[PDB]
């Protein structure tokens, strides 16, 4: 699995999006676009995330 960590907050402004807050660890599910990836949070919610707002989890 591929995990990322949020660097910034994201409100989730389209309904496909997954909102998140800085520090959230998210699992990457799919990369349909270069900068928008499908991700899942610690509650199991899913949606699209802006890649610029996250880093590799390590």
């Amino acid at each position: 699995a591929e995990y990322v960590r949020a660097l910034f907050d994201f409100n989730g402004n389209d309904e496909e999006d997954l909102p998140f807050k800085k520090g959230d660890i998210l699992r990457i599910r799919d990369k349909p676009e270069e900068q928008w990836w499908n991700a899942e949070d610690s509650e199991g919610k899913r949606g699209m995330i802006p890649v610029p707002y996250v880093e590799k989890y390590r």
Binding site: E33, Q35, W36, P52, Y53
Partner: peptide, 10 residues
């Protein structure tokens, strides 16, 4: 500190 640009969608 400064937030990146929110990227364009397809």
């Amino acid at each position: 500190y400064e937030k990146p640009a929110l990227p364009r969608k397809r």
